[PDB]
Amino acid sequence: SGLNMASKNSSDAISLIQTAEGGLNETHAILQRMRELAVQSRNDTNDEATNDRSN
Amino acid sequence: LNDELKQLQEEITRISSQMEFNNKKLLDGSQSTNGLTFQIGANAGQTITMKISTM
């Protein structure tokens, strides 16, 4: 009984961990997008006057 | 001939201080102080600086 219940508990823990990893995948994605935005903002073609970087 | 010359001098000044790219005066001396910096690389510091004199 203890071993079967421990199997159940281990599966529950796997579900929890999968939830957290799925949460962090979108963190990766939006971090990539933010880096792209910064690399684009970094160039001097963009003007602070006409609100290029504020967008 | 001096009439002609004065009009051409007004034009050489006009081209200087009415030239722009994305609302950015180029041939006035704006960039001769610090310079335009282009990010030509993914990482930080991978830049090139440029300067344009008053014309």
Helix (H) or strand (E) holding B5: helix B2-16
Please check whether residue A45 is in contact with residue B22, taking contact to mean a CB–CB distance below 8 angstroms: yes
Going from the C-alpha of A53 to that of each of A8, A35, A47, B17, the distances in angstroms are 52, 14, 7, 25
Q: Would you call B38 and A39 a contact, using CB atoms and an 8 Å cutoff? A: no
Neighbouring C-beta atoms of residue B24, cutoff 10 Å: 16
- What DSSP state is assigned to residue B25? B
Q: How far is C-alpha B49 from the chain's CA centre?
A: 14
Identify the closest residue of chain B to A37 by CA–CA distance: B42
Q: What ranges in chain A are assigned the alpha helix state H?
A: 2-41
User: Residue holding tokens 């970087």?
Assistant: A53
Cβ–Cβ contact B46 with A under 8 A: no
Cα(B27)–Cα(B17) distance, integer angstroms? 6
Which residue type, as a one-letter code, is found at position A9? N
Q: Which residues contact A42 (CB under 8 A, 6 or more apart)?
A: B39
Cα(B37)–Cα(B47) distance, integer angstroms? 6
